[PDB]
Design an enzyme around this catalytic site. Structure first.
Site, PDB file in Angstrom:
ATOM      1  N   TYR A  96       0.850  -1.183   0.000  1.00 46.11           N
ATOM      2  CA  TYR A  96       0.000   0.000   0.000  1.00 46.11           C
ATOM      3  C   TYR A  96       0.888   1.235   0.000  1.00 46.11           C
ATOM      4  O   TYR A  96       2.076   1.162   0.323  1.00 46.11           O
ATOM      5  CB  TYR A  96      -0.951   0.021   1.202  1.00 46.11           C
ATOM      6  CG  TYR A  96      -0.267  -0.125   2.540  1.00 46.11           C
ATOM      7  CD1 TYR A  96       0.046  -1.377   3.047  1.00 46.11           C
ATOM      8  CD2 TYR A  96       0.053   0.987   3.301  1.00 46.11           C
ATOM      9  CE1 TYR A  96       0.667  -1.515   4.270  1.00 46.11           C
ATOM     10  CE2 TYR A  96       0.674   0.859   4.525  1.00 46.11           C
ATOM     11  CZ  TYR A  96       0.977  -0.394   5.005  1.00 46.11           C
ATOM     12  OH  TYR A  96       1.595  -0.528   6.225  1.00 46.11           O
ATOM     13  N   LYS A 150      -4.751  -5.948   7.966  1.00 48.68           N
ATOM     14  CA  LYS A 150      -4.403  -6.292   6.594  1.00 48.68           C
ATOM     15  C   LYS A 150      -3.904  -7.726   6.489  1.00 48.68           C
ATOM     16  O   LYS A 150      -4.161  -8.399   5.487  1.00 48.68           O
ATOM     17  CB  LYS A 150      -3.362  -5.311   6.063  1.00 48.68           C
ATOM     18  CG  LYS A 150      -3.854  -3.877   6.059  1.00 48.68           C
ATOM     19  CD  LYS A 150      -2.716  -2.882   5.969  1.00 48.68           C
ATOM     20  CE  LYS A 150      -3.240  -1.464   6.097  1.00 48.68           C
ATOM     21  NZ  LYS A 150      -2.149  -0.489   6.336  1.00 48.68           N
TER      22      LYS A 150
END
Ligand SMILES: CCCCCCCCCCCCCCCCCC(=O)OC[C@H](COP(=O)([O-])OCC[N+](C)(C)C)OC(=O)CCCCCCCCCCCCCCCCC
Ligand SMILES: CCCCCCCCCCCCCCCCCC(=O)OC[C@H](COP(=O)([O-])OCC[N+](C)(C)C)OC(=O)CCCCCCCCCCCCCCCCC
Ligand SMILES: O=P(O)(O)O[C@H]1[C@H](OP(=O)(O)O)[C@H](OP(=O)(O)O)[C@H](OP(=O)(O)O)[C@@H](OP(=O)(O)O)[C@H]1OP(=O)(O)O
Ligand SMILES: O=P(O)(O)O[C@H]1[C@H](OP(=O)(O)O)[C@H](OP(=O)(O)O)[C@H](OP(=O)(O)O)[C@@H](OP(=O)(O)O)[C@H]1OP(=O)(O)O
Ligand SMILES: O=P(O)(O)O[C@H]1[C@H](OP(=O)(O)O)[C@H](OP(=O)(O)O)[C@H](OP(=O)(O)O)[C@@H](OP(=O)(O)O)[C@H]1OP(=O)(O)O
Lengths: 102, 601, 650, 119, 102
Positions: free
Chosen positions: B347, B446
């Protein structure tokens, strides 16, 4: 509606009622099984129990009404418990004195 | 989006509220005076408006000067105190960690005050400029020169507060170095892409941007953060993190920037828990990429990892031993459990935070994808390597198969607040987190999401948000129990119990136990002293007492066992009261019936 | 020595009017040449007066010529524009005549531009020389600057209005017919860059006007080995050759002129990341932008010397192998190898070497993910001479890539500098980049328009840190630099402006330029609590345990004092014993767990605050006791019912 | 949905915290009334199984009160549990109940006194 | 002003009075129904009950004054339960061994 104060008042009344019912049951047990001195002491203990019962009931109704009116009840309970403890003490000492005398 | 008066009302902390420019008041006065004179402006109106502006300017300048003098006094006093504290280290009574942390707290307060004062002055200058522009635009008279001269004559904005921040940060660093031997709340939110830019803009009006570039440029790869997660074939660590256990570990190898970075951070997250609460301990150490493979094989001894750290000597031995123990534990766990890379979490993170001010920190993670690294399906994704070299940071990874990649559709907003007791989070944060632009999803992970989405066939326990990924989280500007777990994969939500319940569960037990004793007190009394006809009623009282005792034991043993293991506990007793009532009434009936039948039969 | 360059670049028709730079050099050096054995008042007041007279004559002649031809070519352009109206006359315009007139005008404009460039360089050189050799006599920069102010065109490195008018008229002629086309000499995601000088006193205001719209970027150090200075100082070492070819090409606006530098932050003793960067601006006639291309390589201090001096292609292989081992993709490695080859060949062919160092602090304002607007302010700019042109006494070793004097562990290395080896830039340098990707006009960026025309800044077109460094450090030496930037006679004056005069004298220029822009557009259109609560809960739980203990004690002693009157005294005595032990255990366990939980609450560590062993054992013991009592009351000691015997018959 | 509820103005169903205090209050109230009932029933059965004729007759006077308070406790506990399971509330239903039970208990006590002293 | 804290104070007093009632009931029952050896166990139990009630009354009055004047502050209530547990244990042991001896 905020019955938190009402619930606390009901809890206090139920504690008083536990105490009074226990005293009354023990006094009634003294009555139906004791002798003349036992019956006199039973009368004293049942008097204390029923007087505190009426005191607690009247105070509970008054406190609930005052909470509905203002949100707080009478707080002159520096005397009630004091008189209750006093009369319990006098009842026990009277029973002991009668037992020692006879 | 919002008017300037609302921005001023939102950026205050009740200490600068009264002293902000009366932008709305000046705007209303200008509009009303223009309306009352049939759109026209005259010299008397100009003098009245100039008097209003001068009063506002004098108020702002006076408050700014007072706060500037106060902040200078505090900075000087704390600098002298820090110097004295450093000097006292050579004395017979060191100031100790308490004094050093008091100095650090005072320095943090000074940093907060400096930042707030600078923001206040800047916003007031903005308001003055807006008012002057609106004036010389609406009317036919130009006020820019005269009021620019007035502003120069009362310069509440020409104050370099960056030097103060640098000095207080230097003092904080000195205190932390020489001392070395609030409530924190962090929340995670889902942001729809359509709501990203707007959201970002709001945060840009209150916090600056951290740039990981020497030239302060926004390069594509600078913000990239990649993290390989480690798991067994049985996904022991995934279940340990999902079911929040004591000692639940999460092992990762992370790095920042593109795949030319040679420093990989070995990180371990351990979930610790007491009756006070649950906490997470993060411990990471940097390792040169070249050795990472060997370090995972045990071929790279821990003493080799920290050989040059000890050789240089610019590190306290306590920290060196702590890092050595951390590395030894990590390597031992990796060798024992036979951990393997499973999911890579890529990310781009944009971090907003004021320098040296930790009250509000925000991290916006976008382009969040999770790639499959393991070989549980027989396909060797990592060819004897700690990471997959088929892909780098080249989002959106068009070269990957659809099975291997989960592209998270929303961005993740991480808001960390560190509020000292006595104050509250700033208004702008509060209306940011409760607006339509965010969707609060606490405890989003995540690693857990990647394992659940990519390794779904091997997982029989999923987080709560997983069956809710098709829900449209967009809300218009301003009760659901149908979320059913898929077939064969139960939703796992650990249940934490308030400490006071630990006593309440006991309370009722005793409250029942005493009652049973009373019933037992009857049951014994009618057996050892009772007449043979009294034993008949004792039968019922004995049955009732045994039932009450057994129900109490089973209920509260179950409650204790289910408060442990973090299981959901049914706090409603729907059997005990009715059962005890029926049993007691029937016991009394049985006793009375025995006596009456003895009387009449 | 720039006298030879002046002689070679003589345009014969104008040969008389060039600066007699050699003559002024001789009057300046006469104090050394004349009276070579008597250094007593060599520069008298008469010599100073003669020098000022000569400078006055030279200024008058050169700038009178410049203004005369400026006005003559302006008259030619007016005669060419008188046909830009009366459409009937427009249709009758002879294309050949207009083409020839525009050709002659653009050639003359270029000749005048060169005339002004070399003559301005010469005058600046002689003024600086006179100031340096004679500090006790008054500066001659004032006359040069006053004569510069007496000019109908402000020389600030922007294209002269001559070329703007020429481009307009070429566009007009092409719009008319464009049938025979025109001559090749015709000169026409876009972006635009503005550069300003900001005085220190204005800095704090200007940043505010920026911070209204753009957030400030805070430098965050990348986590590294230590992650288990608040704002650094950017240092850029610019390369260049002996003849200063890169500086000349960048100053002469030659499209594709590159600039090569080594950039890092902090001190080299830290071992920071070093980037070798080649930056190029390209502006083609057919294009409408200033496309920028930057090629950067992360170098290592060990390999820099061999990379840039010995032409050793070993660092390329080393870095490629290292990155390939790190897993870098093949396309990235191919691009890196291409960049290495390009920069190496550029250095080798241009014979480049480090020339000057520039250190500054950079503050950036930009919205993340939005390239539309960027603001960059460089402060504390300092230039240090790092050239090896002095063969006898090189400033740095020609086989080393940086000066060892200013890169030592001594905590004030800057004392090592002597006079002429360093220079501080007095103003902050601001650059505003606007990436106008769309072909439309400026999309609501009026605050940039306010800042540019504000009193807080001083716009300097085509400014550059490298050019200013070369001019300030090497400009005064005729052996190296023979051309100077047009913005040099602006540092000495006060660039500050009066805020009230912002709309009294700064609006003079503002509204003059505004009328210019609107007239141009017009003509174009015409064209804690928890701890306390839990502590109280522990208190009450101990109280209830004591209550249970008292109840068990009452039962115990009630049966113990009546065992004799019980129907079965043995069972009653056993019951009394069991209940006495129960009461004792209840009391001791209650106190023990009260103490243990109190320790847990004050010592706030412990997974759970429960203790089921005592409750469970008490309850099971009570169950067993009651069952045993029932059994003995209905078995051998009190045998009345083996199975189901007792009925309603007493 | 293991305690997954959706807040009124949001779209994602989050785990919800249940408050055991509400259930504990009902349990405590019922247990207090059960102490009343157990003590009165113990008194009644003791009088019935060990008292004389007067005690045996007066045992019913306390047994009946025990049954009344047991029924009242069960009914009130279940009604309060039903209320809390949906919305909660319902405090204005325990005024005449406790008063009536105290009145009947006092009447039983006085009646026991009367049969004891008269006979 | 704050009914809840007053009710809690009364409930604590009645919780102590529960101990008083149980112990005093055992003592009075032994006094009126026991033999010579049981009648001194009666005195010991009623002494413990009397001390419990007196401590309850004194603590109730002191806490009532404290809550009336300042407010809250229950952190000082640690000794009472400890002394009551110790006295209960010692009285139980003494009475048991006294009854067993004779
Ligand atoms: C729920 C209330 C009851 C429990 C409250 C107390 C909790 C702890 C339980 C203590 C149990 C006491 C065990 C028995 C005590 C001694 C009894 C005794 O000596 O009996 C001999 C005598 C024997 O009676 P008898 O003369 O008819 O026996 C006939 C057998 N022959 C022919 C051989 C003599 O029984 C009694 O006189 C009274 C016994 C029952 C007491 C009356 C109960 C009144 C309730 C208040 C007092 C509470 C304490 C007693 C609880 C009894 C509950 C039914
Ligand atoms: C500060 C508080 C003050 C005291 C509070 C009120 C105390 C009232 C006293 C209660 C006494 C109850 C007596 C029960 C009947 C006695 C049994 C009997 O017949 O004697 C047999 C035997 C002897 O029988 P006897 O009658 O044949 O003895 C002959 C000897 N003379 C002639 C002297 C009588 O006596 C005992 O040993 C019984 C032991 C004492 C029992 C005490 C039980 C107290 C239980 C209290 C627990 C309360 C829990 C909740 C209860 C709620 C109410 C149910
Ligand atoms: O509502 P305000 O806070 O007073 O500002 C707005 C608007 O700015 P915002 O949309 O960010 O609020 C413009 O303010 P400036 O950019 O000039 O500082 C300005 O518009 P102009 O640029 O055209 O002056 C003006 O809008 P307008 O003057 O057209 O009415 C005004 O809105 P209001 O005047 O309605 O308050
Ligand atoms: O702030 P920390 O004490 O270090 O806790 C961290 C932090 O998130 P939380 O504060 O919400 O718990 C991380 O976010 P960042 O530090 O990267 O900004 C988060 O990351 P994830 O969203 O991927 O879970 C994860 O730490 P990490 O990134 O090292 O895994 C988390 O720890 P928890 O697992 O307890 O949430
Ligand atoms: O030659 P140096 O200037 O002293 O730098 C080297 C170099 O570091 P880098 O890889 O980051 O450039 C070594 O790696 P090589 O490129 O030379 O292969 C590295 O070696 P290790 O990481 O394997 O330990 C390390 O140590 P060494 O001095 O042994 O070469 C380091 O040294 P420094 O600590 O001085 O930077």
């Amino acid at each position: 509606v905020e019955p938190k104060v009402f619930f606390a008042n009901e809890r206090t009344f139920l504690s008083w009622l536990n105490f009074t019912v226990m005293l009354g049951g023990l006094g009634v047990g003294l009555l139906n099984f004791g002798d003349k001195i036992g019956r006199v002491s039973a009368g004293l203990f049942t008097f204390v129990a029923m007087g505190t019962m009426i005191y607690a009931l009247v105070t509970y109704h008054w406190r609930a009404a005052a909470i509905r009116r203002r949100g707080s009840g009478p707080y002159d309970d520096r005397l009630g418990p004091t008189l209750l403890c006093f009369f319990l003490l006098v009842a026990v000492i009277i029973n002991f004195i009668l037992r020692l005398k006879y | 989006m919002a008017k300037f008066g609302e921005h001023l009302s939102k950026s205050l902390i009740r200490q600068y509220s009264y002293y902000y420019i009366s932008y709305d008041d000046l705007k209303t006065e200008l509009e009303d005076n223009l309306s009352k004179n049939n759109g026209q402006w005259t010299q008397e109106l100009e003098t009245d408006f100039l008097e209003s502006l001068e009063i506002e300017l004098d108020k702002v300048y006076t408050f700014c000067k007072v706060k500037h003098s106060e902040v200078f006094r505090r900075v000087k006093e704390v600098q002298e105190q820090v110097q004295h504290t450093v000097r006292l280290l050579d004395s017979n009574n060191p100031p100790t960690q308490l004094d050093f942390e008091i100095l650090e707290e005072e320095l943090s307060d000074i940093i907060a005050d400096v930042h707030d004062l600078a923001k206040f002055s800047r916003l007031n200058y903005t308001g003055f400029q807006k008012i002057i522009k609106k004036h010389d635009k609406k009317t036919g008279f130009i006020l820019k020169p005269v009021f620019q001269v007035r502003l120069d004559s009362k310069p509440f904005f020409k104050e370099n507060y960056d030097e103060l921040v640098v000095k207080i940060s230097q003092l904080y660093d000195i205190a932390r170095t020489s001392g070395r031997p609030f409530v924190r709340q962090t929340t995670k939110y889902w942001v729809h892409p359509d709501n990203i830019t707007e959201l970002k803009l709001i945060i840009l009006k209150h916090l600056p941007v951290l740039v990981f570039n020497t030239n302060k440029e926004f390069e594509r790869e600078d913000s990239a953060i990649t993290s390989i997660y480690f798991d067994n074939e049985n996904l022991d660590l995934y279940y340990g993190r999902l079911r929040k256990d004591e000692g639940a570990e999460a092992h990762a190898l992370a790095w920042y920037g593109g795949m030319s970075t040679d420093t990989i951070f070995v990180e371990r997250k351990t979930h610790r828990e007491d009756w006070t609460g649950e906490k997470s301990v993060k411990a990471r150490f940097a390792l040169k990429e070249r050795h990472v493979n060997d370090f995972l094989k045990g071929k790279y001894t821990v003493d080799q990892v920290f050989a040059k750290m000890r050789k240089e000597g610019k590190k306290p031995m306590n920290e060196i031993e702590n890092l050595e123990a951390l590395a030894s534990e990590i390597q031992y766990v990796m060798l024992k459990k036979k951990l393997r890379p499973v999911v890579r979490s890529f990310y781009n993170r944009t971090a907003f935070q004021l320098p040296g001010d930790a009250r509000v920190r925000i991290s916006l993670d976008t382009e969040l994808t999770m790639v499959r690294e393991d070989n549980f399906d027989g396909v060797d994704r990592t060819h004897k390597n700690w990471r997959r070299t088929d892909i780098g940071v080249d989002w959106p990874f068009k070269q990957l198969d659809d099975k291997d990649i989960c592209r998270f559709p929303y961005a993740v907003l991480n808001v960390k607040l560190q509020t000292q007791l006595g104050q509250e989070p700033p208004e702008w944060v509060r209306e940011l987190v409760g607006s339509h632009l965010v969707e609060p999803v606490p405890k989003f992970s995540k690693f857990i999401h990647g394992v659940a989405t990519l390794l779904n066939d091997k997982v029989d326990s999923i987080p709560f948000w997983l069956p809710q990924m098709d829900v449209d989280i967009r809300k218009p500007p301003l009760f659901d129990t149908q979320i059913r777990a898929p077939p064969g994969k139960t939703i796992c939500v650990p249940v934490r119990v308030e400490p006071k319940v630990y006593f309440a569960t006991e309370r009722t037990y005793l409250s029942w136990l005493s009652i049973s004793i009373l019933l037992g007190g009857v049951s014994t009394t009618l057996l050892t002293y009772g007449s043979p006809t009294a034993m008949i009623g004792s039968i019922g009282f004995f049955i009732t007492s045994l039932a009450v005792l057994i129900r109490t034991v089973m209920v509260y043993a179950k409650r204790v066992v289910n408060i442990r293991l973090k299981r959901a506990v049914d706090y409603e007793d729907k059997i005990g009261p009715g059962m005890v009532s029926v049993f007691l009434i029937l016991s009394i009936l049985f006793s009375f019936f025995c006596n009456l039948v003895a009387k009449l039969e | 020595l720039f006298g030879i360059k002046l002689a070679n670049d003589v345009y014969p028709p104008w040969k008389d009017s060039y600066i007699d730079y050699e003559r002024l050099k001789k009057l300046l050096k006469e104090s050394v040449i004349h009276d070579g054995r008597s250094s007593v008042d060599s520069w008298s007041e008469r010599n100073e007066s003669d020098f000022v007279e000569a400078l006055d004559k030279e200024l008058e002649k050169v700038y009178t010529f410049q203004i005369s031809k400026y006005n003559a070519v302006l008259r030619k352009l007016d005669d060419l524009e008188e046909n830009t109206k009366s459409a009937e006359k427009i249709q009758k315009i002879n294309s050949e005549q207009f083409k020839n007139t525009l050709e002659e005008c653009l050639d003359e404009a270029q000749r005048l531009d060169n005339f002004d460039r070399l003559n301005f360089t010469g005058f600046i050189k002689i003024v600086k020389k006179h100031d340096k050799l004679h500090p006790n006599y008054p500066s001659v920069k004032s006359l040069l600057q006053v004569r510069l102010k007496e000019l109908p065109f402000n020389n600030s490195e922007e294209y002269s209005p001559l070329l703007y008018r020429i481009s307009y008229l070429y566009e007009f002629l092409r719009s008319n017919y464009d049938h025979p086309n025109t001559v090749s000499k015709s000169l026409a995601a876009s972006f635009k860059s503005y550069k300003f000088w900001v005085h220190d006193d204005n800095i704090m205001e200007v940043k505010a006007r920026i911070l209204r719209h753009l957030p400030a970027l805070v430098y965050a150090s990348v986590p590294n080995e230590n992650d288990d200075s608040y704002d650094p100082t950017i240092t850029t070492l610019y390369f260049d050759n002996d003849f200063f070819d890169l500086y000349n090409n960048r100053l002469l606006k030659i499209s594709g002129a590159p600039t090569l530098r080594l950039r890092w932050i902090g001190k080299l003793l830290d071992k920071p990341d070093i980037f070798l960067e080649k930056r190029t601006f390209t502006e083609n006639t057919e294009t409408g932008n200033s496309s920028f291309e930057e090629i950067r390589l992360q170098m290592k201090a060990k390999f820099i010397n061999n990379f840039i001096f010995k032409n050793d292609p070993s660092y390329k292989n080393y870095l490629i192998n290292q990155l390939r081992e790190r897993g870098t993709q093949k396309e990235e490695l191919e691009k890196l190898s291409r960049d290495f080859d390009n920069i190496q060949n550029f250095i080798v062919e241009e014979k480049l070497q480090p020339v000057l160092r520039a250190t500054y602090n950079r503050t950036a304002f930009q919205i993340p993910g939005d390239q539309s607007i960027r603001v960059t302010i460089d402060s504390n700019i300092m230039y240090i001479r790092e050239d090896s042109l002095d063969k006898n006494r090189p400033i740095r070793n020609p086989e080393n890539w940086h000066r060892d004097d200013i890169d030592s562990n001594i905590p004030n290395p800057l004392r090592f500098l002597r006079a002429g080896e360093y220079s501080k830039f007095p103003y902050s340098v601001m650059e505003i980049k606007v990436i106008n990707q769309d072909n439309s006009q400026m999309p609501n960026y009026e605050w940039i328009k306010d800042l540019t025309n504000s009193h807080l800044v001083n716009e300097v077109p085509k400014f550059s840190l490298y050019l200013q460094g070369v001019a300030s450090l090497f400009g005064e030496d005729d052996k190296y630099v023979n051309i100077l930037p047009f913005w040099l006679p602006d540092l000495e004056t006060d660039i500050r402006k009066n805020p009230q005069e912002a709309y009294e004298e700064e609006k003079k220029t503002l509204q003059k330029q505004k009328s210019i822009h609107d007239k141009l557009d017009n003509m174009r259109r015409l064209s804690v609590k928890v701890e306390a609560k839990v502590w109280l809960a522990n208190e009450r739980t101990f109280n209830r345990w004591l209550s249970v203990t008292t109840l068990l004690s009452v039962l115990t002693f009630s049966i113990y004092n009546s065992v004799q009157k019980a129907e079965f005294p043995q069972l009653a005595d056993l019951l009394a014993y069991v209940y006495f032990f129960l009461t004792l255990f209840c009391g001791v366990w209650a106190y023990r767990t009260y103490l243990k939980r109190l320790t847990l609450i004050k010592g706030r560590s412990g997974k759970h605050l429960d203790a089921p062993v005592g409750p469970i054992l008490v309850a099971v013991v009570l169950i067993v006791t009651l069952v045993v009592n029932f059994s003995v009351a209905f078995k051998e000691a009190a045998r009345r019912e083996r199975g189901l015997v007792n009925v309603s018959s007493q």
